[PDB]
Amino acid sequence: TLKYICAECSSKLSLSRTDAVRCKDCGHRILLKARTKRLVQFEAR
Amino acid sequence: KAIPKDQRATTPYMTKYERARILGTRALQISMNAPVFVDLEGETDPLRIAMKELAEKKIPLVIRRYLPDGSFEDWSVEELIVD
């Protein structure tokens, strides 16, 4: 499974496949993908 | 039908188009390993060699100037006065 975040209440869902697209506890179908857990290198120039 | 040499009444001067196509075709032949008739001064570019042959009239070509009535003339580039 992959970690997802709800639109409004911003709760951690982490639903798997074949579970459609819908938040638990609220009916907001907008689910975030969350940012990667690895580091990203940048340059100040 | 090939006008004879005593009846050639065209301009004896080589035009810029004739010089251009003579240098282009001659340089194209030199690029394709053609026998060079002039001793090189260390050149590598084919166009410079073609102009070197034109400066000494060593280019072995003859121009077939087409007349508007269907006839033509044969003016060799060696007898054509350049510039």
């Binding site: 940012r35 580091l39 940048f42 340059e43 100040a44 120039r45 | -």
Partner: protein, 262 residues
């Protein structure tokens, strides 16, 4: 003999002095070296872990890149390309980090003093955020509310201003010469009169007008320079001037060494 320096104003940021007996080439070369060919320490690489701010990531990396740092004992810190290690080591760069998190309802402000030094200095005095505010607070990097974290690791590397403008210790350099126009280098434009429109400069107090009715000037050279150096906060003014003169001397000596080998 050679040049003479007469300091007029000496402060923590601005220092105005008079550098005379110097051909225009050595004065212009001096100010050009002080503006450009002087080393500095600034952030070169920004590694962002978590960022919930409303600002962009590379935007925050740019703001962090513009932040000045201390750069005193930078002479004995080798360059990144000069060191034979992979990436970095305690010989080339200084490692910094920042962790900010909003606590109460009022917004928390992230200052440059929040940066801590987690790398060994081996007796050096670099990496400390320069604090020049009267309230004791560093540079306001960004603002954060409750529920937003910001953790990052910066790699402060050595470089001159030719690589990027963030390595600029000097600021506005006031260059002036010949207060009363006698060398005839500028023809002042005037609508009615040049003496009533153009005001007098400060340095005019240190000389005198050439007096009207006198013979024309054509044998006098350009000298008696007025140079005001201003440092941002990295190194003091004496290290700017001394490091600049030693920089130009190492360049000219490098050209002499480049000519000797021929």
């Amino acid at each position: 003999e050679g040049p003479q320096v007469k300091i007029r104003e000496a402060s923590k940021d601005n220092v105005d002095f008079i550098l005379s007996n110097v051909d225009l080439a050595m004065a212009n070369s001096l100010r050009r070296v002080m503006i450009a060919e002087i080393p500095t320490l600034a952030i070169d690489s920004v590694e962002v872990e978590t960022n919930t701010t409303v600002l962009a990531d590379e935007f925050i990396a740019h703001r962090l890149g513009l932040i000045p740092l201390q750069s005193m004992d930078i002479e004995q810190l080798e360059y990144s390309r000069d060191c034979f290690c992979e990436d970095h080591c305690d010989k080339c760069s200084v490692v910094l980090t920042l962790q900010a998190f909003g606590e109460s309802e009022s917004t928390t402000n992230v200052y440059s003093k929040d940066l801590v030094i987690v790398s060994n200095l081996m007796g050096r005095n670099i990496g400390h955020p320069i604090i020049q505010d009267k309230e004791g607070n560093g540079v306001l990097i960004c603002k954060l509310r409750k529920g937003q974290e910001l953790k990052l690791t910066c790699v402060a590397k050595k470089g001159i201003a030719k690589e990027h403008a963030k390595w600029g210790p000097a600021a506005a350099i006031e260059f002036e010469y010949d207060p009363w126009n006698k060398l005839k280098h500028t023809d002042y434009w005037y609508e009615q009169d040049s003496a009533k429109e153009w005001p007098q400069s400060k340095n005019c107090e240190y000389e005198d007008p050439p007096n009207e009715g006198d013979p024309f000037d054509y044998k006098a050279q350009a000298d008696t320079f007025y140079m005001n150096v201003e440092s941002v906060g990295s190194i003091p003014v004496d290290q700017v001037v001394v490091r600049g003169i030693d920089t130009l001397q190492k360049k000219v000596a490098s050209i002499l060494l480049a000519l000797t080998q021929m």
